[PDB]
Curated annotation (Swiss-Prot), chains A, B:
It comes from the Eukaryota. Heterotetramer. Forms heterotetrameric channels composed of two GluN1/zeta subunits (GRIN1), and two identical GluN2/epsilon subunits (GRIN2A, GRIN2B, GRIN2C or GRIN2D) or GluN3 subunits (GRIN3A or GRIN3B) (in vitro). In vivo, the subunit composition may depend on the expression levels of the different subunits. Belongs to the glutamate-gated ion channel (TC 1.A.10.1) family. NR2B/GRIN2B subfamily. It is found in: Cell membrane; Postsynaptic cell membrane. Component of N-methyl-D-aspartate (NMDA) receptors (NMDARs) that function as heterotetrameric, ligand-gated cation channels with high calcium permeability and voltage-dependent block by Mg(2+). Channel activation requires binding of the neurotransmitter L-glutamate to the GluN2 subunit, glycine binding to the GluN1 subunit, plus membrane depolarization to eliminate channel inhibition by Mg(2+). NMDARs mediate simultaneously the potasium efflux and the influx of calcium and sodium. This is Glutamate receptor ionotropic, NMDA 2B. Detected in oocytes. The chain holds residues 139 to 275 of 1448 of the full protein. A hydrophobic region that gives rise to the prediction of a transmembrane span does not cross the membrane, but is part of a discontinuously helical region that dips into the membrane and is probably part of the pore and of the selectivity filter. The extracellular N-terminal domain (ATD/NTD) endows NMDARs with a unique capacity for allosteric modulation, harboring several binding sites for small molecule ligands that act as subunit-specific allosteric modulators of ion channel activity.
Length: 137, 137
């Protein structure tokens, strides 16, 4: 036994948090890191069941492996216009994605980011590469 | 006397070219370089007079001076969704704007760029920073 949790539950909490602030419109940026499209699947069921017309804008899958000269992550991430972003990746990857988001301008006001447990981790050490106002469980 | 031309005429040719391919919807990215908003003015008259409902989406004025850490040019340029872009600037500036566009993803297929005489210049030397399919007079 552990004093811990899972991925589906966390996704649920992310949804509850979004519902609480009534942020209906959101996108998911994910990486090939484990649990993807099971995250998408859990969200698909949780979002789908509800009567409400919330919108999923984009789902993005980018491999941290085959690291980029192209800034392919920048090239995808720059596209998305949505106010509320769910991110899923390894903590370090989160650092890189956030640097890229800072370049893209996705971190700035009115857009907001929401994270599952893994990125915040211990929470003892926080590279300020993470934007402020970052919301996580 | 010179075997040459002006700015208004070039803008007219750009319009004729766009009309020929029937690209109705377009935006203008410009810089503080000389002739701006006279370019806008000439276009305003030329576009305005015609019965047709073509659309000007955005006009952007960015100073090459006060060169950017912010990638403010990236920050503006990324926004525009229009298929047909008229650009106006110094040749070198065109190099920088194009690198920025390549980062933004504006150079890619279905979007097309159209240029007045100045950027192509001699045409003897062409940094491949310019995207292919670039259309100019």
């Amino acid at each position: 036994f552990q004093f811990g949790p899972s991925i589906e539950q966390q996704a649920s909490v992310m949804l509850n948090i979004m519902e609480e602030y009534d942020w209906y419109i959101f996108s998911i940026v994910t990486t090939y890191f484990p649990g993807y499209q099971d995250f998408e699947n859990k969200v698909r069921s949780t979002i789908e069941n509800s009567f409400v017309g919330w919108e999923l804008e984009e789902v993005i899958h980018l491999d941290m492996s085959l690291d980029d000269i192209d800034s392919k992550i920048q090239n995808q991430l720059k596209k998305l216009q949505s106010p509320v972003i769910l991110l899923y990746c390894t903590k370090e990857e989160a650092t890189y994605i956030f640097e890229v988001a800072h370049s893209v301008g996705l971190t700035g006001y009115g857009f907001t980011w929401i994270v599952p447990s893994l990125v915040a981790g211990d929470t003892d050490t926080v590279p300020d590469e993470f934007p402020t106002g970052l919301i996580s469980v």
